[PDB]
Amino acid sequence: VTYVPAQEKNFTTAPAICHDGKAHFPREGVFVSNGTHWFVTQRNFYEPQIITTDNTFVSGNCDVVIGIVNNTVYDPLQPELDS
Protein backbone atom coordinates (compact mmCIF):
# COMPACT_ATOMS: atom_id res chain seq x y z
CA VAL A 1 0.00 0.00 0.00
CA THR A 2 1.75 3.13 -1.29
CA TYR A 3 1.11 6.87 -1.04
CA VAL A 4 1.35 8.60 -4.43
CA PRO A 5 0.60 12.32 -4.98
CA ALA A 6 -1.10 13.09 -8.27
CA GLN A 7 -1.99 16.62 -9.42
CA GLU A 8 0.42 19.53 -8.98
CA LYS A 9 0.00 23.31 -8.78
CA ASN A 10 2.73 25.96 -9.00
CA PHE A 11 3.10 28.40 -6.08
CA THR A 12 5.58 31.16 -5.21
CA THR A 13 8.13 30.44 -2.45
CA ALA A 14 10.75 32.23 -0.24
CA PRO A 15 13.34 30.96 2.29
CA ALA A 16 12.57 33.54 4.99
CA ILE A 17 10.04 36.22 5.97
CA CYS A 18 11.32 39.48 7.49
CA HIS A 19 9.08 41.21 10.05
CA ASP A 20 10.66 43.32 12.83
CA GLY A 21 14.20 43.28 11.42
CA LYS A 22 14.85 39.67 12.45
CA ALA A 23 14.61 36.75 10.05
CA HIS A 24 11.92 34.10 10.52
CA PHE A 25 12.48 30.49 9.42
CA PRO A 26 9.78 27.77 9.14
CA ARG A 27 9.77 25.18 11.91
CA GLU A 28 7.57 22.70 10.01
CA GLY A 29 6.73 23.10 6.34
CA VAL A 30 7.35 25.55 3.52
CA PHE A 31 6.36 29.10 2.57
CA VAL A 32 3.87 29.37 -0.31
CA SER A 33 2.02 32.26 -1.92
CA ASN A 34 -0.99 32.62 -4.21
CA GLY A 35 0.30 35.97 -5.54
CA THR A 36 -1.11 38.18 -2.76
CA HIS A 37 -0.39 36.88 0.77
CA TRP A 38 2.26 34.47 2.04
CA PHE A 39 0.82 31.23 3.42
CA VAL A 40 2.40 28.51 5.56
CA THR A 41 1.63 24.92 4.57
CA GLN A 42 3.47 21.64 5.00
CA ARG A 43 5.66 19.83 2.49
CA ASN A 44 3.58 16.81 1.41
CA PHE A 45 0.14 18.48 1.34
CA TYR A 46 -1.48 21.86 0.77
CA GLU A 47 -3.17 23.24 3.90
CA PRO A 48 -2.64 27.04 4.02
CA GLN A 49 -2.48 28.66 7.46
CA ILE A 50 -1.75 32.10 8.86
CA ILE A 51 1.79 33.03 9.87
CA THR A 52 2.19 32.37 13.60
CA THR A 53 5.05 32.48 16.09
CA ASP A 54 4.47 28.82 16.97
CA ASN A 55 4.92 27.62 13.37
CA THR A 56 7.95 29.87 12.72
CA PHE A 57 11.39 30.12 14.30
CA VAL A 58 13.40 33.35 14.59
CA SER A 59 17.19 33.69 14.34
CA GLY A 60 19.54 36.32 12.92
CA ASN A 61 18.79 39.52 11.05
CA CYS A 62 17.36 40.17 7.57
CA ASP A 63 20.62 41.28 5.88
CA VAL A 64 22.01 37.72 5.55
CA VAL A 65 19.51 35.41 3.85
CA ILE A 66 19.22 35.73 0.06
CA GLY A 67 15.58 35.82 -1.03
CA ILE A 68 13.99 37.19 2.15
CA VAL A 69 10.57 38.86 1.83
CA ASN A 70 8.61 41.28 4.01
CA ASN A 71 5.26 40.33 5.55
CA THR A 72 3.58 40.57 8.97
CA VAL A 73 3.73 37.77 11.55
CA TYR A 74 0.50 37.40 13.51
CA ASP A 75 0.96 37.16 17.28
CA PRO A 76 -2.01 35.67 19.22
CA LEU A 77 -0.84 37.34 22.46
CA GLN A 78 -1.35 40.85 20.99
CA PRO A 79 -5.22 40.71 20.91
CA GLU A 80 -5.12 39.18 24.42
CA LEU A 81 -3.27 42.20 25.83
CA ASP A 82 -5.71 44.60 24.14
CA SER A 83 -8.85 42.82 25.40
Binding site: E8, G60, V64
Partner: protein
Protein backbone atom coordinates in the same frame (compact mmCIF):
# COMPACT_ATOMS: atom_id res chain seq x y z
CA UNK B 1 21.53 9.26 -20.86
CA UNK B 2 20.37 7.53 -17.67
CA UNK B 3 22.92 9.41 -15.55
CA UNK B 4 22.09 12.73 -17.20
CA UNK B 5 18.40 12.12 -16.47
CA UNK B 6 18.80 11.04 -12.84
CA UNK B 7 21.16 13.89 -11.98
CA UNK B 8 18.53 16.19 -13.47
CA UNK B 9 16.04 15.04 -10.83
CA UNK B 10 18.56 14.91 -8.00
CA UNK B 11 19.76 18.51 -8.44
CA UNK B 12 16.37 20.06 -9.28
CA UNK B 13 13.40 17.80 -8.47
CA UNK B 14 14.50 16.61 -5.00
CA UNK B 15 13.79 13.06 -3.88
CA UNK B 16 10.22 13.13 -5.22
CA UNK B 17 10.99 12.16 -8.83
CA UNK B 18 11.23 8.43 -8.06
CA UNK B 19 8.49 8.41 -5.42
CA UNK B 20 5.90 9.89 -7.77
CA UNK B 21 5.51 12.84 -10.11
CA UNK B 22 8.35 15.35 -10.02
CA UNK B 23 7.72 18.59 -8.12
CA UNK B 24 9.39 21.96 -8.70
CA UNK B 25 11.89 22.44 -5.85
CA UNK B 26 14.59 25.17 -5.72
CA UNK B 27 18.11 24.05 -4.84
CA UNK B 28 18.38 26.41 -1.85
CA UNK B 29 15.32 24.74 -0.30
CA UNK B 30 16.73 21.21 -0.82
CA UNK B 31 19.54 21.57 1.71
CA UNK B 32 17.02 23.02 4.17
CA UNK B 33 15.16 19.71 3.79
CA UNK B 34 18.21 17.44 3.94
CA UNK B 35 19.75 19.07 7.01
CA UNK B 36 16.52 18.43 8.93
CA UNK B 37 16.79 14.65 8.51
CA UNK B 38 20.16 14.50 10.28
CA UNK B 39 19.15 16.97 13.01
CA UNK B 40 20.56 20.27 11.68
CA UNK B 41 18.33 23.36 11.74
CA UNK B 42 18.04 25.91 8.90
CA UNK B 43 20.20 28.46 10.84
CA UNK B 44 23.37 26.67 9.67
CA UNK B 45 22.55 26.70 5.93
CA UNK B 46 21.46 30.29 5.29
CA UNK B 47 24.18 32.06 7.29
CA UNK B 48 27.14 29.93 6.13
Amino acid sequence: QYTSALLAGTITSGWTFGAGAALQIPFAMQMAYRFNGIGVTQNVLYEN
